Amino acid sequence: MVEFPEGFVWGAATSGPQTEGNFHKQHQNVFDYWFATEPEQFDAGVGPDTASNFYNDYDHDLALMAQAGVQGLRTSIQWTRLIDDFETASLNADGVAFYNHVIDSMLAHHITPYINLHHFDLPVALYDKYHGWESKHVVELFVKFAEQCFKLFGDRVDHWYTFNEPKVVVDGQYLYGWHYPQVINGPKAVQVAYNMNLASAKTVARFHELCVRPEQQIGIILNLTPAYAASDDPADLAAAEFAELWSNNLFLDPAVLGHFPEKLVERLTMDGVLWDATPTELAIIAANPVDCLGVNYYHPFRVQRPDISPKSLQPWMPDIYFKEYDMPGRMMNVDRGWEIYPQAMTDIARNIQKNYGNIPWMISENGMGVAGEERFLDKQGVVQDDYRIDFMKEHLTALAKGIAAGSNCQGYFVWSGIDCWSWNHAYHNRYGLIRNDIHTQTKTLKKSAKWFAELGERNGF
Amino acid sequence: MVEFPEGFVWGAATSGPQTEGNFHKQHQNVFDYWFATEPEQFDAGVGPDTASNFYNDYDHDLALMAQAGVQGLRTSIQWTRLIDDFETASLNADGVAFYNHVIDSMLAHHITPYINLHHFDLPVALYDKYHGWESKHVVELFVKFAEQCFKLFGDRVDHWYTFNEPKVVVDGQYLYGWHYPQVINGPKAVQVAYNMNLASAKTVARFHELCVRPEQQIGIILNLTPAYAASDDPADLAAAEFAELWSNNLFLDPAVLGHFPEKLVERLTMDGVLWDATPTELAIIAANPVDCLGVNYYHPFRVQRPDISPKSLQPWMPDIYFKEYDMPGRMMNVDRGWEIYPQAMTDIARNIQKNYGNIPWMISENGMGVAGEERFLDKQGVVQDDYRIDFMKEHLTALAKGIAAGSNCQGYFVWSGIDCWSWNHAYHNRYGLIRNDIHTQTKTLKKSAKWFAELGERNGF
Structure with missing residues (x-):
């Protein structure tokens, strides 16, 4: 009744830091150091030190995922586990053997590997010495690590991603306190946004110098939630215009089109907060767009005019141009605080089709979190998460309309395969x-x- | 008519245990203990205790070798002479002065030193306390003894080798009974082959940190005799392949390529006998391959299908995959029991050139042994050993063919300079x-x- 293109990929998504645990890991990433120092900042005091025990139980874990119909699994390689010395990108022998062990086990369980290179997990030592992503030297070190990933695992990994949602690194580390180091500074965040766009682009170049076969593609994973205007009031339309450029075009355009969106750069320049770029850097960014796109979507996002004029003297922040709006009558996942709106799936598919060349893309994250699922255990200890099935049906229906209108979507990856941290x-x-x-x-x-x-075997429902 | 590269090294090869005698030597190596304890296991009751008296006669001995055209002399430093306390690698003063004397005297007689570290001479104490090359602790203590050699003698020694033919130690000490302790255990022999390769690479690593000059080089001496198939029957072809992997690639590959042959480790794994290795150790082996290769060759090896299935119930031995074969019509050194086949010289050169990056190499051993040379003394007491000149001619002619085809051979060392034990x-x-x-x-x-x-003067014959 709803069916999908032949060859459509049914996947699951996670990341290294949210699954592995820190067993025998050489370096702390910012979240490891954050938990070691401030455990009260984590729900029920649970941090990343064990997470979902994937380091020890990867083989049986992937067998469970194979059972649950994961045809492809996307996860991440931790910089802090793979690299001995960051300056050189020398290898940690034990970390190299681990990722070999999980990739080979993925193939042995007939799971296609999709390897992301970075998932919010900057080595804390690079923040201490260089202030992390604010440093173009740190950009170079990331590329030398990416290069090592390609040479060690390229021989049996076809699908790569430079980054998962660099915007969350920018917002988390430099705007809103979500991530350690918890810096609150607009200008710095603007530079970090630039730096990660540049790092992603040099990685693609390096990847294309090292990739052999034509099946080898590399992409980027972005959240493409639209910024819906609260109303037709011009001030509300101007808030959505800027929120769209800042939350989506800031990464979509350089990655796919090769350039930053000109209206945004004009805005950042007038405000005196534009990044330091060089023409050589912008040229690399223009010449190494991604091969494909990963799209994350969970809940929509709505915006109205700001309470106060952006000319009010206040520290510069992208928020001085838009304020989040709560639509009356919205449909809510009440316990999580998120609106439910599958239609955004269709809007997203259209945008990519109309405005981004209909580049090959996948839904690389879509899912629904619920607390206390032990309350829905049946007799045999199986969670009766019909709500999670209803959620997938609604969004997959929206997806299929987008595809039927001609969008070049090639897969759907659920967040998550196994519950993760x-x-x-x-x-x-x-x-x-x-x-x-x-x-x-x-x-x-x-x-x-x-x-x-069953969805994967029917390729529909 | 037969001519050799400009700069070809004409040398001779021995070892410390085969020449020195045991005068004032602090420790017994395994052969020392074997003779003191079962002299009846030794031809004419002659053990190592006097050997060719090189401890006492080194200066005139070297005068004689210079007269013979020895341009470079390869020999070995005895672990059991140099080291006082094995755990510390503290120094025995007499031994330190002894090797300083011989190296200074090689230089004074215009003989280039080529110092090997180990020639079958494990300290018996280290076998009693740790079971020798089975112990990774014994591996480390060997690195300490190597370290002492490099600091004490590296100022006037450019050319070093880690081991002379580890395979003979594996075979002799753990498979066939040739060497005390005469263990006969397939799986232990596998662990020992690994451990010795690991000791070599750790020594190469230690050497490249303590070497200054660019002409200081460390290599390893292997016997690279090809494993010729008895016939083109597929069973005989299979026996030769494993024979090749086991007898040659087991050491040639980790030493030069930095890794063990995939098909061999696959076989050892299947058979339940693979060595215990760590990722860190394997990385040490991958990162520290030799600079040079010393190549020993005396007589060919031919191989046919084993008589019974390798799946028969019997203790694991490498020989379950191959049986030696005698070819009808072979050229024989009748008294010694060895086939004569100089074409193997060309075959080794081709193999190094084609599959081992044409790494700098030398024939580090080639020669012909004959009993009862009294029968061939002329009227002035000079052995008329024309058979040995012929043997060298045939094998140099084949060597020249390998060089002309482009193999990076840089010297030829006769076994031996002086008759040794x-x-x-x-x-x-x-x-x-x-x-x-x-x-x-x-x-x-x-x-x-x-x-x-004359050969060294004409640079040919």
């Missing part, structure tokens, strides 16, 4: 097709797991 | 350019010594 929220909200009892690290398919396996 | 065979067979009457320790050049001096 969600930064400071930890395991408050569960998203997986598979439950993790984190006290014993015992994992069990949910009802959605079976429905998703 | 050949383990359990003691002095039964003589290899020298120079005779030793071992009763009086009186040395006398043979005819082949004169030929060898």
Whole structure:
């Protein structure tokens, strides 16, 4: 009744830092150091030190995912686990063997590997010495690590991503306190946004110098939630105009089009907060767009005019141009605080089709978190997460309309395969097709797991 | 008519245990303990205790070798002579002065030193306390002894080798009974082959930190005799392949390529006998391959299908995959029991050139042993060893063919310069350019010594 293109990929998504645990990891990333120093900042005091025990139990974990119908799995390689000395990108022998072990086990369980290079997990030592992503030297070090990933694992990994949602690194580390180091500074964030766009682009270049076969593609994962205007009031339309440029075009355009959006750069220049770029850097950015796009979507985003004029003297922030709006009558995931709006899936698909060349793209994240799922265990200990199935049906229906209108979407990756550790929220909200009892690290398919396996065999529902 | 590159090194090869005698040596190596304890295992009851008296006679001995055209002399430093306390690698003063004397005296007689670190001479104490090369602790203590050699003697030694033929130690000590302790255990022999390769690479690493000059080079001496198939029957072809991997690639590949042959480790894994390795160790082996390769060759090896299935119930041995074969019509060194086949010289050169990056290499051993050279003394007491001149001619002619085809061969070292003590065979067979009457320790050049001096002058023959 809803069916999908032949060859469509049914996947699941996570990341290294949210699954592995820190067993025998050489370097701390900012979240590791944050938890070691301020454990009260994490839900129920659970941090990343064990997470979902993937370091020790990867083989049986992937077998569970294979059962739940994961045809492709996307996760991340931790910089802080792979590299011995960051300056040289010398290899940690034990970390190299681990990722070999999980990739080979992925193939052995007939799971296609999708490898992201960075998922919010900057080595804290690089923040201490260079202030992290504010440093173009740190940009270069990232490329030397990416290069090592390609040479070690390129031989059996076809699908790569430079970054998961660099905007969340910019907002998290430099705007809103979400990530350690918790710096609050607009100008710095603007430079970090630039620097990560540049790092992503030099990585693609390096990747294209090292990639052999034509099946080898590299992309970027962005959240493409539209910024819907609260109303037709011109001030509200101007707020959406800027929120769209800042939250989506700031990364979409350089990655796909090769350039930053000109109206944004004009805005940042007038405000005196534009990044330091060089023409050589902008040229690399123009000449190495991504091969494909990963799109994350969970909940829509709406914007009205700001309470006060952006000319008011206040520290510069992108927020001086737009304020979040709560639509009366909205549909709500009440416990999570998120509006439900599958139509954005269709809007996103149209935007890519109309304005971004209909570049090959996938939904690389889509899912629904619920707290206390033990309340829905059946007799045999299987979570009855019909709500999670309803959520996928609604969004997959919206997706299919976008595809039917001609959008070049080639897969759908659920967040998440197994319940995983969600930064400071930890395991408050569960998203997986598979439950993790984190006290014993015992994992069990949910009802959605079976429905998703069946979805892949029918290629529809 | 047969001509050699400009700069070709014409040398001779021995070892410390085969020449020095045990005068004032602090520790027993395994052969020392074996003879003191079962002299009846030794030809004519002759052990290592006097050998060719090189401890006492080194200066005149080297005068004689210079007369024979020895341009470079390869020999070894004995672990059991140099080191006081093995755990510390503290120094025995007499031993330190002894090797300083011989190195200074090589230089004074215009003989280039080529110092090997290990020639079958494990300290018996280290076998009793740790079971020798089975112990990774013994591996580290060897690195300490190597370190001492490099600091004490590296100011006037440019050319070093880690080991002479680890395979003979594996075979002798752990598979076939040739060396005390005469263990006969397949799986231990596998662990020992690994451990010794690991000791070599850790030594190369330690050497490249303590080497200054650019002409200081460290290599390893292997026997690269090809494993010729008895026939083109697929079973015989299969026996030769494993024979090749086991006898040659087991050491040639980690030493030069930085890794063990995939098909061999696949076989050892399947058979349940693979060594215990760590990722960190494997990385040390991958990062520290040799600068040079010393190549020993004496006589060919031919191989046929084993008589019974390798799946038969029997203790694991490499030999379950191959049986030696005698070819009808072979050219024989009848008394010694060895086939003569100089074409193998060309075959080794081709293999190094084609599959091992044409790494700098030398024939580090080639020669012919003959018993009862008294029968061939001329009226002035000079061995008329024309058979040894012929043997060298045939093998140099084949070597020249390998060089002309483009193989990076840089020297030819005769085994031996002076008749030396050949383990359990003691002095039964003589290899020298120079005779030793071992009763009086009186040395006398043979005819082949004169030929060898002309050879070095013409740079050919």
